Write a protein that binds this ligand. Structure first.
Ligand SMILES: O=C1CCC(=O)N1c1ccc(F)cc1F
Ligand SMILES: [Cl-]
Ligand SMILES: [Cl-]
Ligand code: NA
Ligand code: NA
Lengths: 306, 301
Protein backbone atom coordinates (compact mmCIF):
# COMPACT_ATOMS: atom_id res chain seq x y z
CA UNK A 1 0.00 0.00 0.00
CA UNK A 2 0.87 3.68 -0.26
CA UNK A 3 1.42 6.16 -3.08
CA UNK A 4 4.39 8.48 -3.28
CA UNK A 5 5.90 10.83 -5.82
CA UNK A 6 8.64 8.47 -6.99
CA UNK A 7 11.73 9.13 -9.12
CA UNK A 8 13.58 6.50 -11.13
CA UNK A 9 16.74 5.11 -9.50
CA UNK A 10 19.42 7.64 -10.49
CA UNK A 11 22.58 5.51 -10.38
CA UNK A 12 22.88 5.04 -14.16
CA UNK A 13 22.82 8.82 -14.65
CA UNK A 14 25.07 9.67 -11.68
CA UNK A 15 27.88 7.80 -13.46
CA UNK A 16 27.61 10.28 -16.33
CA UNK A 17 27.73 13.65 -14.55
CA UNK A 18 30.86 15.80 -14.90
CA UNK A 19 31.95 19.36 -14.16
CA UNK A 20 32.49 21.81 -17.03
CA UNK A 21 34.32 25.11 -16.55
CA UNK A 22 34.79 27.85 -19.14
CA UNK A 23 36.33 31.07 -17.89
CA UNK A 24 34.67 32.05 -14.64
CA UNK A 25 31.64 29.80 -15.24
CA UNK A 26 31.25 26.31 -13.80
CA UNK A 27 28.23 24.09 -14.51
CA UNK A 28 27.38 20.45 -15.18
CA UNK A 29 27.90 18.22 -18.18
CA UNK A 30 26.60 14.85 -19.34
CA UNK A 31 29.41 12.44 -20.34
CA UNK A 32 28.22 9.68 -22.71
CA UNK A 33 30.59 7.68 -24.96
CA UNK A 34 33.34 10.22 -25.82
CA UNK A 35 31.20 13.41 -25.74
CA UNK A 36 30.27 15.78 -22.90
CA UNK A 37 27.00 17.69 -23.38
CA UNK A 38 26.28 20.97 -21.63
CA UNK A 39 24.38 24.24 -22.23
CA UNK A 40 25.97 26.46 -24.86
CA UNK A 41 25.61 29.48 -22.57
CA UNK A 42 28.65 28.24 -20.62
CA UNK A 43 30.78 30.26 -23.07
CA UNK A 44 29.16 33.62 -22.25
CA UNK A 45 30.17 36.37 -19.91
CA UNK A 46 27.27 38.19 -18.27
CA UNK A 47 27.39 40.95 -20.88
CA UNK A 48 27.55 38.34 -23.67
CA UNK A 49 24.32 36.85 -22.24
CA UNK A 50 22.54 40.16 -22.95
CA UNK A 51 22.66 39.46 -26.69
CA UNK A 52 24.89 36.47 -27.48
CA UNK A 53 26.32 35.53 -30.85
CA UNK A 54 27.19 31.95 -29.96
CA UNK A 55 28.99 30.96 -33.16
CA UNK A 56 31.17 34.07 -32.85
CA UNK A 57 31.86 33.45 -29.15
CA UNK A 58 32.83 29.85 -29.88
CA UNK A 59 35.30 30.39 -32.76
CA UNK A 60 37.52 32.25 -30.27
CA UNK A 61 37.74 29.23 -27.90
CA UNK A 62 40.33 26.47 -27.94
CA UNK A 63 39.71 22.95 -26.68
CA UNK A 64 41.92 23.79 -23.69
CA UNK A 65 39.51 26.58 -22.71
CA UNK A 66 37.10 23.82 -21.60
CA UNK A 67 38.12 22.23 -18.31
CA UNK A 68 36.14 19.03 -17.71
CA UNK A 69 36.49 17.00 -14.52
CA UNK A 70 34.94 13.59 -13.93
CA UNK A 71 35.21 13.26 -10.18
CA UNK A 72 38.87 13.99 -9.44
CA UNK A 73 40.11 13.13 -12.96
CA UNK A 74 40.44 15.73 -15.68
CA UNK A 75 39.12 14.87 -19.14
CA UNK A 76 40.98 16.05 -22.24
CA UNK A 77 38.71 17.94 -24.66
CA UNK A 78 39.79 17.28 -28.27
CA UNK A 79 36.90 18.86 -30.18
CA UNK A 80 34.02 21.23 -29.70
CA UNK A 81 30.85 22.03 -31.65
CA UNK A 82 27.30 23.26 -31.12
CA UNK A 83 23.98 21.57 -31.84
CA UNK A 84 21.17 24.06 -31.33
CA UNK A 85 21.48 25.23 -27.72
CA UNK A 86 23.77 22.37 -26.55
CA UNK A 87 27.58 22.42 -26.69
CA UNK A 88 29.22 19.07 -27.52
CA UNK A 89 32.75 18.57 -26.15
CA UNK A 90 34.54 15.64 -27.74
CA UNK A 91 36.91 14.07 -25.19
CA UNK A 92 39.74 11.57 -25.53
CA UNK A 93 38.15 8.89 -23.32
CA UNK A 94 34.79 7.13 -23.61
CA UNK A 95 32.85 7.02 -20.37
CA UNK A 96 33.24 3.42 -19.13
CA UNK A 97 30.02 3.94 -17.16
CA UNK A 98 27.96 4.89 -20.25
CA UNK A 99 24.56 3.17 -19.87
CA UNK A 100 22.32 1.97 -22.65
CA UNK A 101 20.65 5.25 -23.59
CA UNK A 102 18.60 7.23 -26.11
CA UNK A 103 17.85 10.93 -26.56
CA UNK A 104 14.05 11.43 -26.55
CA UNK A 105 11.93 14.57 -26.66
CA UNK A 106 8.90 14.36 -24.38
CA UNK A 107 5.35 15.80 -24.70
CA UNK A 108 3.74 18.23 -22.25
CA UNK A 109 2.08 16.17 -19.53
CA UNK A 110 4.79 13.54 -19.51
CA UNK A 111 6.84 13.09 -16.34
CA UNK A 112 10.54 12.50 -15.78
CA UNK A 113 13.15 12.33 -13.02
CA UNK A 114 15.53 15.26 -12.54
CA UNK A 115 19.01 14.66 -11.11
CA UNK A 116 19.95 18.03 -9.63
CA UNK A 117 23.71 18.54 -9.72
CA UNK A 118 26.28 21.13 -8.68
CA UNK A 119 29.98 21.18 -9.69
CA UNK A 120 29.44 17.85 -11.41
CA UNK A 121 28.22 16.20 -8.17
CA UNK A 122 24.65 14.82 -7.94
CA UNK A 123 22.83 16.40 -5.03
CA UNK A 124 19.19 15.27 -5.28
CA UNK A 125 16.61 13.50 -7.40
CA UNK A 126 12.96 14.41 -7.87
CA UNK A 127 10.06 13.83 -10.23
CA UNK A 128 8.79 16.60 -12.59
CA UNK A 129 6.14 16.95 -15.27
CA UNK A 130 6.61 18.93 -18.45
CA UNK A 131 3.86 21.53 -17.92
CA UNK A 132 1.41 22.43 -20.71
CA UNK A 133 3.21 25.80 -20.90
CA UNK A 134 6.53 23.90 -21.40
CA UNK A 135 8.09 24.88 -18.09
CA UNK A 136 8.93 22.58 -15.23
CA UNK A 137 8.34 23.34 -11.57
CA UNK A 138 11.83 22.38 -10.50
CA UNK A 139 14.10 23.18 -7.59
CA UNK A 140 17.37 24.62 -8.86
CA UNK A 141 19.98 26.99 -7.45
CA UNK A 142 22.87 28.75 -9.12
CA UNK A 143 25.28 26.14 -10.46
CA UNK A 144 22.56 23.64 -11.47
CA UNK A 145 22.64 24.34 -15.23
CA UNK A 146 23.32 21.15 -17.15
CA UNK A 147 21.46 18.93 -14.68
CA UNK A 148 19.40 16.44 -16.68
CA UNK A 149 16.00 14.79 -16.72
CA UNK A 150 15.35 11.22 -17.73
CA UNK A 151 13.17 8.13 -17.73
CA UNK A 152 14.21 4.45 -17.64
CA UNK A 153 12.43 1.91 -19.87
CA UNK A 154 13.95 -1.48 -19.16
CA UNK A 155 17.71 -1.00 -18.84
CA UNK A 156 17.71 1.95 -21.26
CA UNK A 157 17.97 5.53 -19.99
CA UNK A 158 15.91 7.95 -22.09
CA UNK A 159 17.40 11.41 -21.56
CA UNK A 160 14.77 14.09 -22.19
CA UNK A 161 15.82 17.33 -20.43
CA UNK A 162 18.86 19.54 -19.79
CA UNK A 163 18.44 22.48 -17.44
CA UNK A 164 19.28 25.95 -18.81
CA UNK A 165 17.59 28.77 -16.86
CA UNK A 166 14.98 30.10 -14.43
CA UNK A 167 12.07 32.38 -15.40
CA UNK A 168 10.88 35.34 -13.28
CA UNK A 169 8.07 33.33 -11.67
CA UNK A 170 10.65 30.84 -10.37
CA UNK A 171 9.79 27.99 -12.76
CA UNK A 172 12.38 26.43 -15.03
CA UNK A 173 13.19 26.11 -18.73
CA UNK A 174 15.51 23.83 -20.63
CA UNK A 175 16.09 21.82 -23.77
CA UNK A 176 16.10 18.27 -24.96
CA UNK A 177 19.53 16.67 -25.36
CA UNK A 178 19.62 17.78 -29.00
CA UNK A 179 19.49 21.38 -27.75
CA UNK A 180 15.90 22.21 -28.75
CA UNK A 181 14.12 24.29 -26.10
CA UNK A 182 10.90 23.17 -24.54
CA UNK A 183 8.64 26.19 -24.97
CA UNK A 184 9.01 29.66 -26.52
CA UNK A 185 12.25 30.52 -24.72
CA UNK A 186 15.74 31.59 -25.77
CA UNK A 187 19.08 31.25 -23.96
CA UNK A 188 19.68 34.94 -23.31
CA UNK A 189 19.60 37.05 -20.16
CA UNK A 190 16.21 38.66 -20.67
CA UNK A 191 12.99 38.38 -18.70
CA UNK A 192 10.82 35.81 -20.47
CA UNK A 193 7.41 35.05 -19.03
CA UNK A 194 5.93 31.60 -18.96
CA UNK A 195 2.48 31.49 -20.50
CA UNK A 196 -0.56 30.83 -18.35
CA UNK A 197 -0.48 27.20 -17.34
CA UNK A 198 -3.23 24.60 -17.32
CA UNK A 199 -3.87 21.37 -15.42
CA UNK A 200 -3.03 18.02 -17.01
CA UNK A 201 -6.45 16.32 -17.05
CA UNK A 202 -5.43 12.76 -17.99
CA UNK A 203 -2.90 12.79 -15.13
CA UNK A 204 -5.46 14.00 -12.58
CA UNK A 205 -7.66 11.08 -13.65
CA UNK A 206 -4.73 8.66 -13.29
CA UNK A 207 -4.14 9.97 -9.76
CA UNK A 208 -7.82 9.52 -8.86
CA UNK A 209 -7.46 5.88 -9.99
CA UNK A 210 -4.34 5.62 -7.81
CA UNK A 211 -6.45 6.93 -4.93
CA UNK A 212 -9.15 4.32 -5.49
CA UNK A 213 -6.58 1.52 -5.70
CA UNK A 214 -5.33 2.73 -2.31
CA UNK A 215 -8.81 2.71 -0.74
CA UNK A 216 -9.66 6.43 -1.09
CA UNK A 217 -13.15 6.33 -2.62
CA UNK A 218 -15.33 9.12 -1.20
CA UNK A 219 -15.40 11.11 -4.47
CA UNK A 220 -16.89 8.28 -6.52
CA UNK A 221 -20.50 8.81 -7.59
CA UNK A 222 -23.29 7.16 -9.61
CA UNK A 223 -22.99 9.45 -12.64
CA UNK A 224 -21.18 9.36 -15.97
CA UNK A 225 -20.74 11.89 -18.74
CA UNK A 226 -19.59 12.40 -22.33
CA UNK A 227 -16.27 13.65 -23.67
CA UNK A 228 -17.97 16.67 -25.19
CA UNK A 229 -19.77 17.54 -21.95
CA UNK A 230 -16.72 16.96 -19.80
CA UNK A 231 -14.43 18.94 -22.11
CA UNK A 232 -16.64 22.03 -21.73
CA UNK A 233 -16.12 21.67 -17.98
CA UNK A 234 -12.37 21.23 -18.45
CA UNK A 235 -12.07 24.35 -20.58
CA UNK A 236 -14.02 26.34 -17.99
CA UNK A 237 -11.61 25.27 -15.25
CA UNK A 238 -8.38 25.70 -17.29
CA UNK A 239 -7.92 21.95 -17.59
CA UNK A 240 -6.41 20.49 -20.73
CA UNK A 241 -8.82 18.86 -23.19
CA UNK A 242 -9.36 15.14 -22.69
CA UNK A 243 -8.97 13.20 -25.93
CA UNK A 244 -10.04 9.71 -26.93
CA UNK A 245 -6.41 8.58 -26.77
CA UNK A 246 -6.30 9.67 -23.12
CA UNK A 247 -9.41 7.58 -22.52
CA UNK A 248 -7.81 4.59 -24.25
CA UNK A 249 -4.59 4.96 -22.23
CA UNK A 250 -6.65 4.90 -19.02
CA UNK A 251 -8.43 1.74 -20.19
CA UNK A 252 -6.40 -0.61 -17.98
CA UNK A 253 -7.18 1.39 -14.85
CA UNK A 254 -10.88 1.57 -15.77
CA UNK A 255 -10.99 -2.22 -16.12
CA UNK A 256 -9.03 -2.83 -12.91
CA UNK A 257 -11.12 -0.52 -10.71
CA UNK A 258 -14.58 -0.80 -12.27
CA UNK A 259 -14.72 2.97 -12.82
CA UNK A 260 -15.00 3.97 -16.47
CA UNK A 261 -13.05 7.04 -17.52
CA UNK A 262 -16.22 9.02 -18.18
CA UNK A 263 -17.50 7.68 -14.86
CA UNK A 264 -14.34 9.04 -13.20
CA UNK A 265 -14.75 12.19 -15.32
CA UNK A 266 -18.08 12.75 -13.60
CA UNK A 267 -16.22 12.53 -10.27
CA UNK A 268 -13.71 15.12 -11.47
CA UNK A 269 -16.48 17.40 -12.76
CA UNK A 270 -18.10 17.36 -9.32
CA UNK A 271 -14.75 18.04 -7.62
CA UNK A 272 -14.10 21.02 -9.90
CA UNK A 273 -17.60 22.46 -9.43
CA UNK A 274 -17.90 21.80 -5.68
CA UNK A 275 -14.44 21.38 -4.19
CA UNK A 276 -13.30 18.74 -1.74
CA UNK A 277 -15.55 19.81 1.19
CA UNK A 278 -12.72 19.62 3.70
CA UNK A 279 -11.61 16.16 2.60
CA UNK A 280 -8.33 14.96 1.09
CA UNK A 281 -7.34 12.46 -1.59
CA UNK A 282 -4.10 10.51 -1.07
CA UNK A 283 -3.22 13.10 1.55
CA UNK A 284 -3.66 16.10 -0.74
CA UNK A 285 -6.19 18.95 -0.68
CA UNK A 286 -5.35 19.80 -4.30
CA UNK A 287 -5.89 17.67 -7.38
CA UNK A 288 -2.47 16.30 -8.30
CA UNK A 289 -1.50 16.26 -11.98
CA UNK A 290 2.14 15.08 -12.11
CA UNK A 291 1.47 11.30 -12.22
CA UNK A 292 0.87 9.80 -15.69
CA UNK A 293 -1.29 6.72 -16.26
CA UNK A 294 1.94 4.75 -16.72
CA UNK A 295 3.37 6.12 -13.47
CA UNK A 296 0.31 4.88 -11.59
CA UNK A 297 0.40 1.42 -13.16
CA UNK A 298 4.15 1.08 -12.58
CA UNK A 299 3.99 2.12 -8.93
CA UNK A 300 0.93 -0.06 -8.21
CA UNK A 301 2.70 -3.02 -9.92
CA UNK A 302 6.35 -2.89 -8.74
CA UNK A 303 8.31 -2.67 -12.02
CA UNK A 304 12.09 -2.67 -11.46
CA UNK A 305 15.24 -1.44 -13.27
CA UNK A 306 18.33 -3.40 -12.25
CA UNK B 1 14.16 28.91 -6.72
CA UNK B 2 11.51 26.23 -6.30
CA UNK B 3 10.98 23.72 -3.52
CA UNK B 4 10.51 19.99 -4.07
CA UNK B 5 10.33 16.84 -2.01
CA UNK B 6 13.79 15.72 -3.06
CA UNK B 7 15.53 12.41 -2.39
CA UNK B 8 19.22 11.66 -2.29
CA UNK B 9 20.72 10.22 -5.49
CA UNK B 10 20.28 6.49 -5.09
CA UNK B 11 23.25 5.06 -7.00
CA UNK B 12 25.41 4.37 -3.94
CA UNK B 13 22.61 2.22 -2.49
CA UNK B 14 21.63 0.61 -5.80
CA UNK B 15 25.09 -1.00 -5.92
CA UNK B 16 24.38 -2.77 -2.61
CA UNK B 17 20.94 -4.26 -3.33
CA UNK B 18 20.75 -8.06 -3.65
CA UNK B 19 18.09 -10.76 -3.60
CA UNK B 20 17.84 -13.15 -0.64
CA UNK B 21 15.90 -16.40 -0.94
CA UNK B 22 15.07 -18.88 1.80
CA UNK B 23 12.62 -21.65 1.02
CA UNK B 24 9.80 -20.16 -1.02
CA UNK B 25 10.40 -16.60 0.28
CA UNK B 26 12.35 -14.01 -1.69
CA UNK B 27 13.07 -10.49 -0.46
CA UNK B 28 15.82 -7.86 -0.58
CA UNK B 29 19.15 -7.72 1.20
CA UNK B 30 21.76 -4.99 1.64
CA UNK B 31 25.31 -6.07 0.69
CA UNK B 32 28.04 -4.07 2.45
CA UNK B 33 31.64 -5.35 2.56
CA UNK B 34 31.23 -9.14 2.99
CA UNK B 35 27.89 -9.09 4.87
CA UNK B 36 24.31 -9.17 3.54
CA UNK B 37 21.67 -7.68 5.86
CA UNK B 38 18.01 -8.63 5.56
CA UNK B 39 14.89 -9.02 7.73
CA UNK B 40 15.03 -12.18 9.82
CA UNK B 41 11.46 -13.08 8.90
CA UNK B 42 12.79 -14.39 5.59
CA UNK B 43 13.19 -17.69 7.52
CA UNK B 44 9.51 -17.86 8.55
CA UNK B 45 7.17 -20.40 6.97
CA UNK B 46 3.38 -20.06 6.74
CA UNK B 47 3.05 -21.66 10.20
CA UNK B 48 5.61 -19.26 11.73
CA UNK B 49 3.75 -16.06 11.18
CA UNK B 50 2.14 -15.49 14.57
CA UNK B 51 4.69 -16.68 17.14
CA UNK B 52 7.92 -17.58 15.35
CA UNK B 53 10.78 -18.63 17.55
CA UNK B 54 13.57 -17.20 15.45
CA UNK B 55 16.40 -18.85 17.41
CA UNK B 56 14.79 -22.27 16.88
CA UNK B 57 14.09 -21.61 13.19
CA UNK B 58 17.63 -20.34 12.54
CA UNK B 59 19.55 -23.17 14.25
CA UNK B 60 17.96 -25.56 11.72
CA UNK B 61 19.41 -23.68 8.73
CA UNK B 62 22.68 -24.31 6.90
CA UNK B 63 24.66 -21.64 5.07
CA UNK B 64 23.59 -23.26 1.80
CA UNK B 65 19.88 -22.83 2.65
CA UNK B 66 20.32 -19.08 1.91
CA UNK B 67 20.47 -18.13 -1.78
CA UNK B 68 21.94 -14.66 -2.39
CA UNK B 69 21.93 -13.27 -5.93
CA UNK B 70 23.76 -10.06 -6.86
CA UNK B 71 22.79 -9.15 -10.38
CA UNK B 72 23.20 -12.44 -12.21
CA UNK B 73 25.82 -13.74 -9.77
CA UNK B 74 25.22 -16.21 -6.93
CA UNK B 75 27.17 -15.21 -3.84
CA UNK B 76 28.39 -17.94 -1.51
CA UNK B 77 27.12 -17.73 2.07
CA UNK B 78 29.82 -18.80 4.52
CA UNK B 79 28.20 -17.79 7.81
CA UNK B 80 25.03 -16.49 9.37
CA UNK B 81 23.98 -14.78 12.57
CA UNK B 82 20.98 -12.93 13.97
CA UNK B 83 21.19 -9.44 15.49
CA UNK B 84 17.84 -8.45 16.98
CA UNK B 85 15.41 -8.57 14.01
CA UNK B 86 18.06 -8.53 11.23
CA UNK B 87 19.84 -11.52 9.71
CA UNK B 88 23.50 -11.09 8.77
CA UNK B 89 24.72 -13.48 6.06
CA UNK B 90 28.49 -13.59 5.71
CA UNK B 91 29.43 -14.06 2.06
CA UNK B 92 32.70 -14.97 0.35
CA UNK B 93 32.93 -11.74 -1.71
CA UNK B 94 33.25 -8.19 -0.47
CA UNK B 95 30.94 -5.93 -2.46
CA UNK B 96 33.28 -3.93 -4.74
CA UNK B 97 30.66 -1.16 -4.87
CA UNK B 98 30.49 -0.68 -1.07
CA UNK B 99 30.28 3.08 -0.40
CA UNK B 100 31.56 4.85 2.65
CA UNK B 101 28.74 4.15 5.08
CA UNK B 102 27.48 4.18 8.65
CA UNK B 103 24.43 2.88 10.49
CA UNK B 104 22.39 5.57 12.27
CA UNK B 105 19.18 5.18 14.31
CA UNK B 106 16.97 8.21 13.74
CA UNK B 107 14.38 10.07 15.86
CA UNK B 108 10.77 10.90 14.92
CA UNK B 109 10.63 13.85 12.54
CA UNK B 110 13.83 12.91 10.75
CA UNK B 111 13.60 12.42 6.98
CA UNK B 112 15.35 9.93 4.70
CA UNK B 113 15.19 8.56 1.17
CA UNK B 114 13.76 5.10 0.45
CA UNK B 115 14.98 2.97 -2.47
CA UNK B 116 12.03 0.65 -3.11
CA UNK B 117 13.24 -2.68 -4.44
CA UNK B 118 11.82 -5.98 -5.59
CA UNK B 119 13.80 -9.16 -6.21
CA UNK B 120 17.02 -7.25 -5.52
CA UNK B 121 16.34 -4.65 -8.24
CA UNK B 122 15.60 -0.99 -7.50
CA UNK B 123 12.17 0.30 -8.50
CA UNK B 124 12.06 3.93 -7.43
CA UNK B 125 13.28 6.43 -4.91
CA UNK B 126 11.23 8.70 -2.69
CA UNK B 127 11.39 10.77 0.48
CA UNK B 128 9.87 9.70 3.85
CA UNK B 129 9.83 10.89 7.45
CA UNK B 130 9.84 8.92 10.70
CA UNK B 131 6.37 9.77 12.01
CA UNK B 132 5.84 10.61 15.70
CA UNK B 133 4.14 7.21 16.07
CA UNK B 134 7.28 5.47 14.71
CA UNK B 135 5.71 4.46 11.39
CA UNK B 136 6.53 5.71 7.92
CA UNK B 137 4.07 6.54 5.16
CA UNK B 138 5.78 4.65 2.37
CA UNK B 139 4.94 3.02 -0.94
CA UNK B 140 5.64 -0.70 -0.62
CA UNK B 141 4.23 -3.77 -2.34
CA UNK B 142 4.63 -7.44 -1.56
CA UNK B 143 8.29 -8.33 -2.07
CA UNK B 144 9.63 -4.98 -0.87
CA UNK B 145 10.86 -6.17 2.53
CA UNK B 146 14.55 -5.43 2.95
CA UNK B 147 14.38 -2.15 1.00
CA UNK B 148 16.29 0.49 2.94
CA UNK B 149 16.09 4.14 3.95
CA UNK B 150 19.14 6.35 4.01
CA UNK B 151 20.70 9.79 3.92
CA UNK B 152 23.92 10.84 2.20
CA UNK B 153 26.27 13.35 3.90
CA UNK B 154 29.16 14.40 1.72
CA UNK B 155 29.75 10.99 0.14
CA UNK B 156 28.92 8.84 3.18
CA UNK B 157 25.67 6.85 3.21
CA UNK B 158 23.89 6.74 6.57
CA UNK B 159 21.54 3.74 6.54
CA UNK B 160 18.70 4.36 8.98
CA UNK B 161 15.82 2.06 8.02
CA UNK B 162 15.11 -1.46 6.71
CA UNK B 163 11.54 -2.28 5.71
CA UNK B 164 9.84 -5.19 7.50
CA UNK B 165 6.03 -4.96 7.35
CA UNK B 166 2.82 -3.10 6.55
CA UNK B 167 0.32 -2.33 9.31
CA UNK B 168 -3.48 -2.47 8.86
CA UNK B 169 -3.81 1.27 8.26
CA UNK B 170 -1.51 0.98 5.25
CA UNK B 171 1.54 2.53 6.93
CA UNK B 172 4.90 0.86 7.33
CA UNK B 173 7.14 -0.46 10.10
CA UNK B 174 10.76 -1.56 10.19
CA UNK B 175 14.08 -1.46 11.96
CA UNK B 176 17.41 0.28 12.07
CA UNK B 177 20.34 -1.63 10.55
CA UNK B 178 21.14 -3.07 13.98
CA UNK B 179 17.74 -4.77 13.72
CA UNK B 180 15.92 -2.80 16.44
CA UNK B 181 12.39 -1.83 15.47
CA UNK B 182 11.24 1.74 15.42
CA UNK B 183 8.35 1.99 17.88
CA UNK B 184 6.64 -0.80 19.80
CA UNK B 185 6.29 -3.15 16.84
CA UNK B 186 7.46 -6.77 16.54
CA UNK B 187 8.06 -9.05 13.56
CA UNK B 188 4.96 -11.18 14.24
CA UNK B 189 1.59 -11.14 12.47
CA UNK B 190 -0.27 -10.73 15.76
CA UNK B 191 -2.61 -7.74 15.77
CA UNK B 192 -0.68 -4.49 15.98
CA UNK B 193 -1.89 -0.94 15.43
CA UNK B 194 -0.01 2.32 15.12
CA UNK B 195 -0.66 4.99 17.70
CA UNK B 196 -2.61 8.08 16.76
CA UNK B 197 -0.33 10.11 14.59
CA UNK B 198 0.48 13.79 15.02
CA UNK B 199 1.96 16.56 12.89
CA UNK B 200 5.69 17.28 13.11
CA UNK B 201 5.52 20.88 14.32
CA UNK B 202 9.21 21.83 13.97
CA UNK B 203 9.15 20.61 10.35
CA UNK B 204 6.06 22.67 9.48
CA UNK B 205 7.83 25.75 10.88
CA UNK B 206 10.94 24.94 8.82
CA UNK B 207 8.78 24.70 5.72
CA UNK B 208 7.11 28.05 6.45
CA UNK B 209 10.65 29.50 6.64
CA UNK B 210 11.36 27.91 3.24
CA UNK B 211 8.28 29.67 1.88
CA UNK B 212 9.57 33.04 3.12
CA UNK B 213 13.02 32.36 1.64
CA UNK B 214 11.39 31.63 -1.72
CA UNK B 215 9.57 34.95 -1.51
CA UNK B 216 6.12 34.36 0.06
CA UNK B 217 4.95 36.27 3.14
CA UNK B 218 1.12 36.29 2.96
CA UNK B 219 0.63 34.08 6.05
CA UNK B 220 2.70 36.17 8.49
CA UNK B 221 0.97 38.36 11.09
CA UNK B 222 1.80 41.15 13.50
CA UNK B 223 1.63 38.87 16.56
CA UNK B 224 3.94 36.72 18.65
CA UNK B 225 3.30 34.00 21.22
CA UNK B 226 4.87 32.45 24.23
CA UNK B 227 6.19 28.93 23.71
CA UNK B 228 3.73 27.55 26.25
CA UNK B 229 0.70 29.29 24.70
CA UNK B 230 1.75 28.04 21.28
CA UNK B 231 1.95 24.46 22.53
CA UNK B 232 -1.42 24.75 24.28
CA UNK B 233 -3.01 25.77 20.97
CA UNK B 234 -1.13 23.48 18.61
CA UNK B 235 -1.86 20.31 20.58
CA UNK B 236 -5.57 20.96 20.06
CA UNK B 237 -4.85 20.38 16.35
CA UNK B 238 -2.87 17.14 17.01
CA UNK B 239 0.47 18.87 16.49
CA UNK B 240 3.52 17.59 18.36
CA UNK B 241 4.82 19.76 21.22
CA UNK B 242 7.52 22.23 20.20
CA UNK B 243 10.52 22.05 22.54
CA UNK B 244 13.29 24.49 23.28
CA UNK B 245 15.52 22.15 21.27
CA UNK B 246 13.25 22.82 18.31
CA UNK B 247 13.31 26.58 18.88
CA UNK B 248 17.12 26.49 19.04
CA UNK B 249 17.31 24.36 15.87
CA UNK B 250 15.23 26.95 14.00
CA UNK B 251 17.70 29.74 14.93
CA UNK B 252 19.61 29.79 11.62
CA UNK B 253 16.44 30.01 9.50
CA UNK B 254 15.05 32.74 11.75
CA UNK B 255 18.27 34.72 11.35
CA UNK B 256 18.26 34.36 7.58
CA UNK B 257 14.67 35.55 7.16
CA UNK B 258 14.54 38.05 10.03
CA UNK B 259 11.45 36.36 11.49
CA UNK B 260 11.77 35.33 15.14
CA UNK B 261 10.86 31.71 15.89
CA UNK B 262 7.97 32.60 18.19
CA UNK B 263 6.69 35.07 15.56
CA UNK B 264 6.61 32.20 13.06
CA UNK B 265 4.76 30.14 15.70
CA UNK B 266 2.16 32.93 15.81
CA UNK B 267 1.77 32.63 12.02
CA UNK B 268 1.29 28.87 12.33
CA UNK B 269 -1.32 29.36 15.09
CA UNK B 270 -3.28 31.65 12.76
CA UNK B 271 -3.03 29.23 9.83
CA UNK B 272 -4.44 26.40 11.97
CA UNK B 273 -7.29 28.75 12.92
CA UNK B 274 -8.02 30.16 9.44
CA UNK B 275 -7.01 27.63 6.82
CA UNK B 276 -5.50 28.91 3.60
CA UNK B 277 -8.62 30.68 2.25
CA UNK B 278 -7.97 29.43 -1.27
CA UNK B 279 -4.24 30.18 -1.23
CA UNK B 280 -1.24 27.84 -1.33
CA UNK B 281 2.19 27.76 0.29
CA UNK B 282 5.04 26.40 -1.85
CA UNK B 283 2.41 24.82 -4.08
CA UNK B 284 0.50 23.01 -1.29
CA UNK B 285 -2.96 23.59 0.17
CA UNK B 286 -2.00 21.75 3.36
CA UNK B 287 0.80 22.41 5.83
CA UNK B 288 3.78 20.18 5.00
CA UNK B 289 5.67 18.39 7.76
CA UNK B 290 8.20 16.09 6.03
CA UNK B 291 10.96 18.71 5.53
CA UNK B 292 13.35 19.15 8.46
CA UNK B 293 15.21 22.36 9.30
CA UNK B 294 18.32 20.67 7.88
CA UNK B 295 16.47 19.77 4.65
CA UNK B 296 15.31 23.35 4.17
CA UNK B 297 18.81 24.82 4.55
CA UNK B 298 20.30 22.22 2.22
CA UNK B 299 17.67 22.85 -0.49
CA UNK B 300 17.36 26.67 -0.32
CA UNK B 301 21.08 27.22 0.60
O1 LIG C 1 17.92 35.59 -17.13
C1 LIG C 1 16.87 35.16 -17.46
C2 LIG C 1 16.62 34.03 -18.44
C3 LIG C 1 15.18 33.65 -18.30
C4 LIG C 1 14.51 34.82 -17.62
O2 LIG C 1 13.36 35.08 -17.62
N1 LIG C 1 15.56 35.62 -16.97
C5 LIG C 1 15.33 36.68 -16.01
C6 LIG C 1 15.71 37.97 -16.34
C7 LIG C 1 15.51 39.00 -15.45
C8 LIG C 1 14.91 38.74 -14.22
F1 LIG C 1 14.71 39.77 -13.34
C9 LIG C 1 14.53 37.45 -13.89
C10 LIG C 1 14.74 36.42 -14.79
F2 LIG C 1 14.36 35.15 -14.46
CL1 LIG D 1 -25.42 9.80 -15.38
CL1 LIG E 1 -2.20 19.90 -0.92
NA1 NA F 1 -19.28 8.73 -11.59
NA1 NA G 1 20.65 -5.68 -7.35
Amino acid sequence: SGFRKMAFPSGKVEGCMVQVTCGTTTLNGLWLDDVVYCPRHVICTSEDMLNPNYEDLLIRKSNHNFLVQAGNVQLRVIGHSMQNCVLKLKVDTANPKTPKYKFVRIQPGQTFSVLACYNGSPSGVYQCAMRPNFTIKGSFLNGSCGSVGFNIDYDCVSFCYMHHMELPTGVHAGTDLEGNFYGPFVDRQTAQAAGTDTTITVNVLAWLYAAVINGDRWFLNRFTTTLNDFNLVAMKYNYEPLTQDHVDILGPLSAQTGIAVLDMCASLKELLQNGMNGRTILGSALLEDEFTPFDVVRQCSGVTFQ
